[PDB]
Amino acid sequence: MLSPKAATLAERSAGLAFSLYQAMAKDQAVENILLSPVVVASSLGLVSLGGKATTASQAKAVLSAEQLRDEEVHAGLGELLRSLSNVTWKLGSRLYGPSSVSFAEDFVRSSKQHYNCEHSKINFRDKRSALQSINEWAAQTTDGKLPEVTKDVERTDGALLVNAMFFKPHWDEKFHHKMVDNRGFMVTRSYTVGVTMMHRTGLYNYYDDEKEKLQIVEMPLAHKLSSLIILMPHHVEPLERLEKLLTKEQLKIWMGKMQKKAVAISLPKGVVEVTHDLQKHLAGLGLTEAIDKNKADLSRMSGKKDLYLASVFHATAFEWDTEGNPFDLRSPKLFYADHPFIFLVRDTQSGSLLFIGRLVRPKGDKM
Amino acid sequence: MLSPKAATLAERSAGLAFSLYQAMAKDQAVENILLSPVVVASSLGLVSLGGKATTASQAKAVLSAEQLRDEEVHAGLGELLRSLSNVTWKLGSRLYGPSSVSFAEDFVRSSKQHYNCEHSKINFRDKRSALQSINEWAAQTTDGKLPEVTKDVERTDGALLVNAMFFKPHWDEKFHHKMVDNRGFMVTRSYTVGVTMMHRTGLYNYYDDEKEKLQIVEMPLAHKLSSLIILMPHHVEPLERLEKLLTKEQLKIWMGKMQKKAVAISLPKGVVEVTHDLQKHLAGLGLTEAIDKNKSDLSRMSGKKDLYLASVFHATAFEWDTEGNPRSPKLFYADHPFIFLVRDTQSGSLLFIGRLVRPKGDKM
Amino acid sequence: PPGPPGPPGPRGPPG
Amino acid sequence: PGPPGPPGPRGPPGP
Amino acid sequence: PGPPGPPGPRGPPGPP
């Protein structure tokens, strides 16, 4: 069980991830979203850790932890990251600084300790090798499930925070290995993509909102320690309408309305790869000084004001697979996910949000 | 294998059936169409056989066999009728003339030889009993699958040729017996009928014409000896537009464009009973003299000008059933009118041409 | 061994 | 093999 | 023997 301080940070981490999701969902350039609240919060913790004055105070303020000691922040976030570990979960965090810069010992030790932070130098004078090394580090961290973070780095003169993840929900009741076929996923009413779908009928917590024209299903993960929640509108439509409805309170209402029913869950099968640069969105949440070359004070990090937060790459490979525990209906309700949906990974014990995302366009070709 | 003469007759029989189909499709009174090219050709053959002068020349001209000798047309249509016999298939040809008239020995011998045409004298003024006996003959011929030919016969004074058929395509890959449910078939955009549909996903020869907004599927029959071809527009629309496109040449183009793809075929299940009186339509194709009491010269039939062709009943019971031998699919969902063909694999010979516009069922 | 997939769903409603 | 699965969902509406 | 299969594919679209 989480300590009271880690628990409060977790609540803010969730709220922050909802704000980040909403910010990104408003961008018409953004298709799929994948956010780990904890990893997003740990990134602000590094800014507090490495920074001074306003640069650091903003990070604590975004984290709503301004009344806590710096040690309490780092310890709590450290505890939350540690709590994500409970094969099917892989995380790596690396800070890339220019060749010229030198990371400070104290920072290097603290970041290793609380945030499991790896440190590297990067030379963008040879851009190919610079990209190659980031992408390879991510490939190795996720054992090839995330083969590329970015095709290009916009800002080359600062610090680069890269988080590389691989998550594979392991079901409490597995899908049959043969319950897999090729279907069409409707990205829009006029655009279909060829996907692999996996299928299972079982008793699931389910709710059909006839008023808001949406379905909600809860899929318990291994040993009911966490669960995957799927929110999908009845019709193929842009997620904008549903996203407006999505709040911590609305989710509580929907979940109370759920009941154990026979449900034929059909989901796309495969790895969804998402890379976000959180840089612009975090600045919108109050982290203004850290991302500005002229105002950034990351001097606890390097010893000098020779650094700014150029990027915060949140890169995830989320795998939808048949695997789960062996542990396991005449007229089921269909939860046929062949159109965009919103999903959440919730920790059962804490209520702590592990993932927030949406699948709008899976891998495949047009038809 | 067909003789070269039978093969050329078969090509004319197909072309004739295309002309007949087109003629009928233009008629607003016509709903479902079911034609056996061979049996249709065999009917013109009997008019050539029993009629003389213009009455016979028209019959050959309709069939587009005017450049052939009379014996070539009769012998070759006989071989075609014979080759068909080998899937469930039942045929009966029968000549009904008035009880007073006399069938000529020479014609009786030739009609039974080539066309297997049994002859029967009947009182047509005796309506209920007349109908009862024709409809019973058809019921027995088809083993009750076609219980009725017609509800009425308008011309008591002339000759009646009746063809009674039962055809049941037996699939090379059967439908699962439980893959059957109740759906709605859209006869029009304002009219839906409750039907039973049968469903199967498999590899089928398929073509989707994006330009002409239509789908074409080939469903092989038992041992790939023949196949059932389905032509349907993408959306619910009367078949008129598709029918304009339908030609022997266009069909050849479409079939060459087909390829083996995963197809989810959904078809109405049941027996479709179709009874056509070809009389009016054949007259429109050139067979004018034979159907007219005042111009008909069927003297090779009845030794005198005491006969005319009142009707040519082409009666078929086509059964769509699940029975047959033991990537992301494309939908071929036949819940709206479609055109279909039964083709012989070896010859290319057209066994059936038709369309299902309104299946059995109640309005919903 | 699992059974085959079921039939396609009914046609959608009009516009 | 098991029995066929249930029918799929109803199709989308027309334009 | 064996469990039921998956649901079938989505139905065709409605008329305009």
Curated annotation (Swiss-Prot), chain C:
Post-translational modification note: Hydroxylated on proline residues.
The entry's localization annotation reads: Secreted, Extracellular space, Extracellular matrix
Instruction: Report the superkingdom from the record.
Output: Eukaryota
Annotated Pro residues bias? 1-15
Subunit architecture: Homotrimer or heterotrimer.
Stated name of the protein:
Collagen alpha-1(XXVI) chain
Organism whose genome encodes this protein: Homo sapiens (Human)
Q: Which residues of the full protein are shown?
A: 309 to 323 of 441
